[PDB]
């Protein structure tokens, strides 16, 4: 009677449930009139239309894998749980929304992977001298924060191509700093020096065999190094069960995409691994610099926290870059990088002091709402990130998934994942826009003009010729009605000259 459920037509079961969640459909053979077999559940029940045949799908969110959150990540890193639930099954009927929860906890003794991406330009010659014993000093300071630390080293200057590199005279190619009467290394784009290893003494050995180079322009090809350090997992040596810190140390500006046109390079960065067996970025002279969007995507894809260890003269520039790249922090590096050890420890604490959610493979018809609940019981709504946390905290994010209309795939899955963590919640969406009566799928039967209309879910759905209650109009259904029901049997014209043949009724 009341509510749009009754007013918005009848058609079949597909139409009436597709309007609004409350609406229900009766498929069994019952009173032809009364309930438009499309009213609410209690109205339909009121008309006794449920011989255990009432159709009314309900949106549900049932978990599948619900391993509890781990308390310490020191041992059995493959069995460290930082997100619960890990997998849920979500059923959504059209235009309906169901809410679910996800607890994120950052364990204490989680393994850490620190890759030191050092700008080996000439202005960082003194910086290279303050790093000779960084590996030993880094292990001691990281000892209290983790029991499994791996460190690696990589270097970059810029693209080895004019005008970035001096090309004259021929002695300036094998020694770019000939004219200040010094010996340097030939310009390189990005060389991978040390694979991520737990033996921290290798970092000290490999860092004192490095030498700086000399380029011409102020900006450096650092984003090229960040891309290659991110996408070359097997070469750099990232671990799945570890935190990934990419310490990016530089003192000058950085080249961005479309800056490679100055050197004659127009081919965009494809985000692939181009480091060969010689540990050199082989596509540095043939491929443009990566853009912020592409670089951000690969950082999120590989779960890498990027740290800008930049000097004071470019601290504001990279602080503005960090606002566009999630999961990144900026530290003020010294002119000789004498405090990079304290910068890494502070950045790791700063990075782990914030938990930010990230959704991937979200269907275009799904809309998510996050109510962040940080320390204490502050349910800050509309926020998918908590800030000000510490190591060991357990935040919770209530999420509401709303679907516009009804997608035809009826089976989609997306993942909700904290930034920089492998652990994720896999949500399996199972849209329910069809009834159980459609499983029968009754074809044209004798109840619809002896085989002129499908008898599915009680109401005879049938082609434009034969319409009406019994799908027998054979014409339009209005003036000719379906079976001249307006004229009861014979001797009674259009309901005794009261109701004519209109709207397919007396």
């Amino acid at each position: 009677g009341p509510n749009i459920c009754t007013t918005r037509g009848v058609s079949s079961c597909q139409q009436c449930l597709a309007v609004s969640p409350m609406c229900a459909w009766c498929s069994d053979e019952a009173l032809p009139l009364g309930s438009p077999r499309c009213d609410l559940k209690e109205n339909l029940l009121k008309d006794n239309c449920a011989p255990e045949s009432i159709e009314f799908p309900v949106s549900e969110a049932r978990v599948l894998e619900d391993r509890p959150l781990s308390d310490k990540g020191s041992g059995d890193s493959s069995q460290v749980t930082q997100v619960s639930p890990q997998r849920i099954a979500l059923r959504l009927r059209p235009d309906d929304s169901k809410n679910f929860s996800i607890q994120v906890r950052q364990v204490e003794d989680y393994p850490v992977d620190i890759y030191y991406l050092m700008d080996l330009s000439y202005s960082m010659k003194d910086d290279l001298w303050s790093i000779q014993n960084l590996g030993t000093k880094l292990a001691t300071q990281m000892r209290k924060l983790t029991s499994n630390l791996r460190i690696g080293f990589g270097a970059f200057v810029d693209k080895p191509v004019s005008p970035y590199m001096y090309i004259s005279p021929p002695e300036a190619l094998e020694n770019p700093c000939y004219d200040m009467k010094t010996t340097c290394l030939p310009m390189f784009g990005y060389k991978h020096v040390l694979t991520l290893t737990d033996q921290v003494t290798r970092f000290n050995e490999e860092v004192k065999k490095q030498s700086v180079s000399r380029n011409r322009d102020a900006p450096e090809g650092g984003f090229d190094a960040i891309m290659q350090a991110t996408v070359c997992d097997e070469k750099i040596g990232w671990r799945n069960d570890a935190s990934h810190l990419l310490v990016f140390t530089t003192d000058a500006k950085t080249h961005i995409a479309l800056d490679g046109r100055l050197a004659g390079i127009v081919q965009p960065n494809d985000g692939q691994c181009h480091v060969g067996s010689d540990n050199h970025y082989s596509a540095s002279t043939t491929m443009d610099y990566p853009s912020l969007g592409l670089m951000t995507e690969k950082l999120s894809q590989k779960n890498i926290n990027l740290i800008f260890a930049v000097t004071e003269n470019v601290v504001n520039l990279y602080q503005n870059y960090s606002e566009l790249i999630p999961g990144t922090t900026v530290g003020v590096l010294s002119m000789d990088s004498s405090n990079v050890l304290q910068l890494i420890v502070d950045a790791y604490g700063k990075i782990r002091s914030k938990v930010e959610l990230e959704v991937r493979d979200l269907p275009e018809e799904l809309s998510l709402s996050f109510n962040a609940t940080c320390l204490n019981n502050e349910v800050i709504p509309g926020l998918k990130s908590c800030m000000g946390l510490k190591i060991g905290d357990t935040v919770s994010f209530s999420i509401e998934a709303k679907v516009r209309g009804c997608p035809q795939e009826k089976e989609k899955s997306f993942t909700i994942k904290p930034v920089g963590f492998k652990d994720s919640l896999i949500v399996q969406v199972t849209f329910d826009c069809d009834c159980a009566c459609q499983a029968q799928a009754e074809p044209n039967s004798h109840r619809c003009n002896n085989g002129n209309g499908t008898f599915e879910c009680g109401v005879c759905r049938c082609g434009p010729g034969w319409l009406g209650s019994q799908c027998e109009c054979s014409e339009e259904d209005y003036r000719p009605s379906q079976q001249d029901e307006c004229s009861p049997r014979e001797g009674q014209p259009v309901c005794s000259q009261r109701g004519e043949c209109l709207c397919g009724q007396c």
């Binding site: 005008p163 004219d179 102020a218 995409a257 100055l262 127009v266 853009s291 870059y321 339009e476």
Partner: protein, 600 residues
């Protein structure tokens, strides 16, 4: 809207030559329009990727093009104690081609130059050079404003002041109406950004073959700046000319500095003396605001409007909040000279990493509606990421936020379809400006031709005999006197260069709301509510008129007499799409509703 995407002309250069990197229209003395296409990686005589320029004559089928020959030999002249040297290997001849009158200006931004003087040298730096050429007369000239004989030592003592060694002049080139060639040198003044301008007539008259370092007495260059905002700004990445200060005796330059003020980007408008009049700051960091600029009057107020492309702009999608789509900014020039403010329109791309705004081409009046139109390209946009060109139409308040047409890349993936765009030139002389799209990845250029636009004029005149109480008009088969009315329908087709074979189909409709069985009004010829007529409006300026006779049922026949009578007239092109591509684009009121009602 008009650009035919089915009949495409494909000009192909040598494979692996980036044929299509830069393209422009060239007009001969006879008026024939040719296409000059830059191929900055064409193999030189010694199998080195020097570069090349192809002059493509206009053909419907297209194909290979003749090569415009330039000097591709390295030069070495000993003047005084110095030794001037030019290195044309990998110079990228064709990275910027612009045509003015009978002169074609092909630039090589990456041509190197060194000055040896005993042990000291000036360093082999990509000073950049531009080769001017008159194809109809064979006159060849060069313009390298950033060549110098100053040794490196001197620059070090001067803190690299006036260091035009890394100019890369020709990166972006434009010629003003008077004939002043304005070259863009983003690497000038130690990558600060430079702009060099010299008349084309004076370049030809001053160029002496064999002389490598010479000064054009009428040239002018921008000024080096100590402001840290300009450092590494690449001021000169894109250059455009226009009128932005009132009087038309002075031309104004529009210079794109995509990395101005720490990769923020800016677009400055300056007079002929490089005095900044107005600066437009970028909106997002590293968005490359200023990678492409274009000056055209889109809103038809008589005052030029500025369009700025930001190919790497990242939008807030509320699901990712940073999606690299690209954006184009539109600035409408107000009444006051120095009054440009916030952008009047923000055209944002939709495909991720599509680089929307990488090329903006003023198309002129594409549909001839009285307002100029533009075409923005996404070289890696589209659902398949192969390239897209989007056509935007001008209007009274600026541009349409919605593209009137989308051109998908006919070339495979990675062709960078849309990197170079050029329009507002009628290459087939059909009265409508066309568009040439360059895909250097495929080493091919696509030519899109604008087919004519027909402005439909539908007028259905129906007699007001909608009351059935008259019962006077009779039926041919049986008198049955009923209040019938005549249906006079007229259709008008207006548009420039409309073909004489245009045969529109007019679909009449009577009592549209009622079903076919319940049709109250019928004709007296076929007794069917509504009919289809194939009027041949092509070749007839008159709004062809024709009257038809229709009758209504009896009073008792329609119990729902109260219901209104809906008369509709729909016109559309003839169903000849399968036989041939639609020779016209029907624009205007295609369908008209002549709704009436029964009174008596």
């Amino acid at each position: 809207l008009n650009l035919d995407p089915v009949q495409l002309t494909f000009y192909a250069g040598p494979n692996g030559s980036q044929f299509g990197f830069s393209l422009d229209f060239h007009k001969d003395s006879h008026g024939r329009v040719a296409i000059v296409v830059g191929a900055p990686r064409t193999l030189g005589p010694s199998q080195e990727e020097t570069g090349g320029v192809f002059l493509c004559p206009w053909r419907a089928e297209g194909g290979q093009c003749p090569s415009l020959l330039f000097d591709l030999r390295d030069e070495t002249r000993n003047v005084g104690s110095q030794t001037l040297q030019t290195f044309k290997a990998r110079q990228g001849l064709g990275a910027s081609v612009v045509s003015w009158s009978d002169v074609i200006v092909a630039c090589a931004p990456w041509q190197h130059w060194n000055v040896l003087e005993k042990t000291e040298e000036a360093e082999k730096t990509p000073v950049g050079s531009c080769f001017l050429a008159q194809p109809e007369s064979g006159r060849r000239a060069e313009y390298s404003p950033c060549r110098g004989n100053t040794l490196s030592r001197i620059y070090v003592e001067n803190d690299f002041s006036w260091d035009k060694r890394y100019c890369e002049a020709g990166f972006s080139s434009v010629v003003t109406q008077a004939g002043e060639l304005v070259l863009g040198a983003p690497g000038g003044y130690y990558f600060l950004g430079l702009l060099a301008q010299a008349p084309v007539a004076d370049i030809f008259s001053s160029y002496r073959p064999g002389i490598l370092l010479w000064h054009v007495s009428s040239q002018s260059l921008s000024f080096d700046s100590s402001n840290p905002e300009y450092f590494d700004g690449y001021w000169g990445y894109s250059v455009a000319v226009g009128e932005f200060d009132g009087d038309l005796n002075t031309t104004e330059y529009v210079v794109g500095a995509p990395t101005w003020s720490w990769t923020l980007g800016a677009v400055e408008i300056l007079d002929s003396y490089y005095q900044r009049l107005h600066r437009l700051r970028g909106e997002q960091m590293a968005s490359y605001f200023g990678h492409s600029v274009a000056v055209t009057d889109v809103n038809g107020d008589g005052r030029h409007d500025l369009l700025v492309g930001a190919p790497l702009y990242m939008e807030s999608r509320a699901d990712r909040k940073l999606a690299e789509v690209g954006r184009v900014y539109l600035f409408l020039q107000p009444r006051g000279p120095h009054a440009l403010g916030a952008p009047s329109l923000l055209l944002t791309g939709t495909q991720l990493y599509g680089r929307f705004g990488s090329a903006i081409a003023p198309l002129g009046d594409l549909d001839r509606d009285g307002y100029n139109d533009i075409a923005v390209a996404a070289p890696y946009g589209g659902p398949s990421g192969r390239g897209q060109v989007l056509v935007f139409l001008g209007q009274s308040e600026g541009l349409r936020s919605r593209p009137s047409q989308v051109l998908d890349s006919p070339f495979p993936t990675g062709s960078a379809f849309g990197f170079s765009l050029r329009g507002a030139v009628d290459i087939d002389d059909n009265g409508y400006p066309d568009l040439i799209v360059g895909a250097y990845g495929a080493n091919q250029v696509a030519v899109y031709r604008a087919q004519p636009v027909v402005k439909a004029s539908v007028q259905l005149l129906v007699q007001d005999s909608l009351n059935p109480a008259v019962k006077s008009c009779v039926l041919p088969q049986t008198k049955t006197p009923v209040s019938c009315f005549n249906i006079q329908m007229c259709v008008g087709a207006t548009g420039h260069n409309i073909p004489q074979k245009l045969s529109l189909n007019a679909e009449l409709q009577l009592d549209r709301q009622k079903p076919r069985q319940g049709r109250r009004v019928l004709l007296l010829g076929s007794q069917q509510a509504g009919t289809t007529l194939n009027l041949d409006l092509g070749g007839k300026h008159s709004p062809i008129c024709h009257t038809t006779m229709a009758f209504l049922r009896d009073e008792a026949d329609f119990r729902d007499k109260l219901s209104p009578i809906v008369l509709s007239l729909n016109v559309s092109l003839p169903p000849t799409e399968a036989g041939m591509a639609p020779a016209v684009v029907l624009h205007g009121d295609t369908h008209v509703q002549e709704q009436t009602r029964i009174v008596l």
